[PDB]
Paper text:
We were able to determine the crystal structure of the BsSufS dimer to 1.7 Å resolution, revealing high structural homology to its E. coli counterpart. One molecule of [name] was found within the asymmetric unit (AU) and could be built to completeness. The BsSufS monomer forms a tightly intertwined homodimer with another monomer across the crystallographic symmetry axis. The interface and architecture of the BsSufS homodimer closely resemble those of E. coli [name]. The enzyme consists of two domains: A large, N-terminal domain (residues 1–294) and a smaller, C-terminal domain (residues 295–406). In the N-terminal domain, a 7-stranded, parallel β-sheet is sandwiched between several α-helices to form a tightly packed core. This domain harbors the active site pocket, where the cofactor PLP is bound to Lys224 as an aldimine. Furthermore, residues 253–265 (herein referred to as the ‘β-hook’) form a hairpin-like structure that latches on to the other monomer. The small, C-terminal domain consists of a 4-stranded, parallel β-sheet and four α-helices containing the flexible ‘Cys361-loop’ with the nucleophile Cys361. We found BsSufS in the product-bound state, with alanine bound near Cys361-persulfide, suggesting that one reaction cycle had occurred.
Author numbering:
A (entry chain A), B (entry chain A): 1 to 413
């Protein structure tokens, strides 16, 4: 856990922006990669790239063993029962779409309900909007408490015997809320519904055990957990996946192809059409190895300390609003009084500090918060308390700068 | 074009398999990558990885400029009119599925026809099987001539005023046939149909000009053209894409998101849901730069010479059947009399030689050929006449080996 030694493994952190040391606080948008991951990609392309299938030629066997070896690493990492339940996809968004297309569009009829929350990312809203439209079903929202948490009483109220799907984020990328997924799964199941978990913001930062959560589906993205871009995972309980039709069709996912009719491969390959994301999946396996070596519990404890420190330091600033609860993941979404968050991000980037401004792909949540946009600083395993000091110092300077501009302007005119 | 200097750029070629120099003749399954591409990925992750959108922070702007810069490289490379017509996808298979989902399922009714050919890869068969099933339309096949080419008279016969979609490979990955796509497009259009071109095997090997072809849709894969795995392109004429609904939904592809209804971004981003395939797309741009520097006409001429040499040398072998026409792309699919092609591939890999055996994702074509499987050697810009000499020498040895085993066995028993 020596943080200097961790940071030494991430080449991208060692540079300057606008003549200042880079302070990267946008890991919730995408994470940075250690040498172990980057070198895994290089070794792949330098030494054993080939299309998959064993029993053909040597490099082909190496590539296949790498690819399927990564599938097993994923299985172990989330504690799934079987590799049949681990599907490689392009990312969380594609994973959630696959569930909406192959499960929801097949199992919803008029009168059935899909239940989501106001804090969902767009990836876990729009596929369900489309699925309910296609089927004549109903979309419903679980309300939030005043601090941006979900009460289990509101879940019990909203979920009914007509509910077929409950879809929810494990962790919000805006509020930092950790939702009570295990308890929500029980409520879903008691009502005859499945639960679909958007795990994009939880997987990088805390241990996932899908057997303990009892989630029916779980989606994650490589690029948020030190892995390559363009790859993700869909986990689904084997019994559900066995009864779902493929979302995409082509080579690799078939068994027999006739002129008019075809039959599908067994799981997981039923859901993997075309040449797979070979290098990316292998690289994601390397990210998992890297994270496990540090320890996800160790990473969670570091983030708990960074979050506590940030919240305290933000409370030292006058004229700053922080959104969400005290108990949270490693991020802070905020606004400065009388400064647009896009201007905050601009001024901070001039100091080397990378944060994000906008709606963070959660427009319904922005409306619930009664704002159009916010600024967000997000932390990961390579971030330090010194970086949070720099952030809060820069925010104080930003307030002073805009105050002076306002007074200069009012005096003129 | 010095071939030694070209080969020097591909680190993977400089190794031994089973104590023999590697002879990689499976580029039709996947291509190998030059240092220029591999180093592009490394630079990305080492220096400017961030999620996309300009106007936020410095690395974010660099990443976005890289990503959108690659889109323009693609546009130029295939001579599309606009970047609005260039969509990044996971690969050819996903591209073809997107057309089947968003165009075919929206424009087909009972009585309408989708017309394909017996030589199509599964990626360009199964999505249409599913689309016709979903809509009550009819799937029809254009017959092949005796040498595995398509006659334009058969296309005129098969395509009718009820035909809405003609889908065809530019180049067959089994026969090596180059199909007359420009003339087929005219026949499609005259009948009121669109044409969908599977360009996975043409793009790596010959110049593509979509304005000259007049194709409505064109799909390609990065991994076959010296680029990263997990990325491809869908080209579509802007007027068609404007009227098609998205195939996947989420962040990045929206403009406004309400509780129940959402509106979409303009092209091309309408069709790119979620965090994009950032590194892969940038790497594909580097592959395009690399190929353009060598020259695609130069690559086509090299492959024409390799194909001519291979066909001549195969005709020197007794007891070998080659499938397809004399005028062809850079590949040879074949069978040895009385030797299963899987055994051919196994014996060749013991000599360092990588070829592929099976159905090559073209089961209907195997049936048309009256075989269950075949062996395939395929060539690209880093392959030489010496490698073809090694292949034919190994095939002669294979025939002699199996003949001796057969005689040994018959004498015993
Ligand atoms: C490889 C290939 C495909 C499939 O492409 P993927 O990259 O596997 O999606 C489709 N058509 C042809 C002609 C090919 O050679
Ligand atoms: C980033 C994120 C997503 C979207 O994931 P992509 O990798 O962009 O597909 C979904 N949900 C949450 C909670 C996220 O943080």
């Amino acid at each position: 856990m020596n943080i200097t030694d961790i940071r030494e493994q991430f080449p991208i952190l060692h540079q300057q922006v606008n003549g200042h040391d880079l302070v990267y606080l946008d890991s919730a948008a995408t994470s940075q990669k250690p040498r172990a991951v980057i070198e895994t990609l290089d070794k792949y392309y330098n030494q054993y790239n080939s299309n998959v299938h064993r029993g053909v030629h040597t490099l082909g066997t190496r590539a296949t063993d790498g690819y399927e070896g990564a599938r097993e690493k994923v299985r172990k990492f989330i504690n799934a029962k079987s590799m049949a339940e681990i599907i490689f996809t392009k990312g969380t968004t594609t994973s959630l779409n696959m569930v909406a297309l192959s499960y929801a569009r097949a199992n919803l009829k008029p009168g059935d309900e899909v239940v989501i929350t106001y804090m969902e990312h767009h990836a876990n809203i729009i596929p369900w909007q489309q699925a309910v439209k296609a089927t004549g079903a109903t979309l419903k929202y679980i309300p939030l408490q005043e601090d941006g948490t979900i009460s289990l009483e509101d879940v019990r109220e909203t979920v009914t015997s007509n509910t077929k799907i409950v879809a929810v984020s494990h962790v919000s990328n805006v509020l930092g809320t950790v939702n009570p997924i295990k308890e929500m799964a029980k409520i879903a199941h008691d009502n005859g519904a499945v639960i679909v978990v958007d795990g994009a913001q939880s997987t990088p930062h805390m241990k996932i055990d899908v057997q303990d959560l009892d989630c029916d589906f779980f989606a994650l993205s490589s690029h948020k957990m030190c892995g390559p871009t363009g790859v993700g995972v869909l986990y689904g309980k084997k019994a559900l996946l066995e009864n779902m039709e493929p979302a995409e069709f082509g080579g690799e996912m078939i068994d027999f192809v006739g002129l008019y009719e075809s039959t599908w491969k067994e799981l997981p390959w039923k859901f993997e059409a075309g040449t797979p994301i070979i290098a990316g999946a292998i690289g994601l396996g390397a990210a998992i190895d890297f994270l496990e070596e540090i320890g996800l519990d160790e990473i969670s404890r570091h983030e708990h300390k960074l979050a506590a420190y940030a919240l305290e330091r933000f409370r030292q600033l006058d004229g700053v609003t922080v959104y969400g609860p005290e108990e949270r993941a490693g991020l802070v979404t905020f606004n400065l009084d009388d400064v647009h968050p896009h201007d905050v991000a601009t001024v901070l980037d001039a100091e080397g500090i990378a944060v994000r401004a906008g709606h963070h792909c959660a427009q319904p949540l922005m409306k619930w918060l009664d704002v159009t946009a916010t600024a967000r600083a997000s932390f990961y395993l390579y971030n330090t308390e010194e970086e949070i000091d720099k952030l809060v110092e820069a925010l104080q300077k930003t307030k002073e700068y805009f105050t002076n501009v306002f007074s200069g302007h009012h005096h003129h005119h």
